Design an enzyme around this catalytic site. Structure first.
Site, PDB file in Angstrom:
ATOM      1  CD  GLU A  35      -3.095  -0.580   0.078  1.00 18.69           C
ATOM      2  OE1 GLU A  35      -3.030   0.411  -0.623  1.00 18.69           O
ATOM      3  OE2 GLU A  35      -3.959  -1.515  -0.031  1.00 18.69           O
ATOM      4  CG  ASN A  46      -8.716   7.095  -4.443  1.00 15.80           C
ATOM      5  OD1 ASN A  46      -7.969   6.294  -5.073  1.00 15.80           O
ATOM      6  ND2 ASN A  46      -8.736   7.231  -3.121  1.00 15.80           N
ATOM      7  CG  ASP A  49     -13.910   7.700  -4.663  1.00  8.71           C
ATOM      8  OD1 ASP A  49     -12.817   8.238  -4.556  1.00  8.71           O
ATOM      9  OD2 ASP A  49     -14.146   6.718  -3.921  1.00  8.71           O
ATOM     10  CB  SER A  51     -12.189   8.940  -1.310  1.00  8.47           C
ATOM     11  OG  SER A  51     -11.766   7.920  -2.251  1.00  8.47           O
ATOM     12  CG  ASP A  53      -6.682   5.467  -0.841  1.00  8.97           C
ATOM     13  OD1 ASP A  53      -7.783   5.288  -0.335  1.00  8.97           O
ATOM     14  OD2 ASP A  53      -6.287   5.206  -1.979  1.00  8.97           O
ATOM     15  CG  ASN A  60     -11.192   5.724   0.704  1.00  9.16           C
ATOM     16  OD1 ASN A  60     -12.359   6.093   0.878  1.00  9.16           O
ATOM     17  ND2 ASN A  60     -10.443   5.949  -0.387  1.00  9.16           N
TER      18      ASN A  60
END
Length: 130
Positions: A35, A46, A49, A51, A53, A60
């Site tokens: 990750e 992102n 959408d 959002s 991370d 998220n």
């Protein structure tokens, strides 16, 4: 901060992640590795959408932390997303534990499924003394 492999493994053991909700330490190691590369300041927006991370576990903002700009988001971990960018990972660990308490467990992270599930993950903890 960018943790070294065995330094992180020892940290996660002390934080009680070994076997948490049936998830071995090596699985958590594999997840952090893919990750963020063991990087607590990593962030990924992102665009699709809106959002983001955050942190070592790439948690998220749509469900787990509040960043205020996400959109129909919840804050299941009851934390500011800023808490997931600290060098001290206690809050990130507490949140990751909350994430796996949902039915999907560790499968919540698609990176886990593609890169760690049904693989030999012993390499992540080899020689760390954990």
């Amino acid at each position: 901060k960018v943790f070294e492999r065995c330094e992180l493994a020892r940290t996660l053991k002390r934080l009680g992640m070994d076997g948490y909700r049936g998830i071995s330490l090596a699985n958590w190691m594999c997840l952090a590795k893919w990750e963020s590369g063991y990087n607590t300041r990593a962030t990924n927006y992102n665009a699709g959408d809106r959002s983001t991370d955050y942190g070592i576990f790439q948690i998220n903002s749509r469900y787990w932390c509040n960043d205020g700009k996400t959109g129909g988001a919840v804050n299941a971990c009851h934390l500011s997303c800023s808490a997931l960018l600290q060098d001290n990972i206690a809050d990130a660990v507490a949140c990751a534990k909350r994430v796996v308490r949902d039915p999907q467990g560790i499968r919540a992270w698609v990176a886990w499924r593609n890169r760690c599930q049904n693989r030999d993950v012993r390499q992540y903890v080899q020689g760390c003394g954990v």
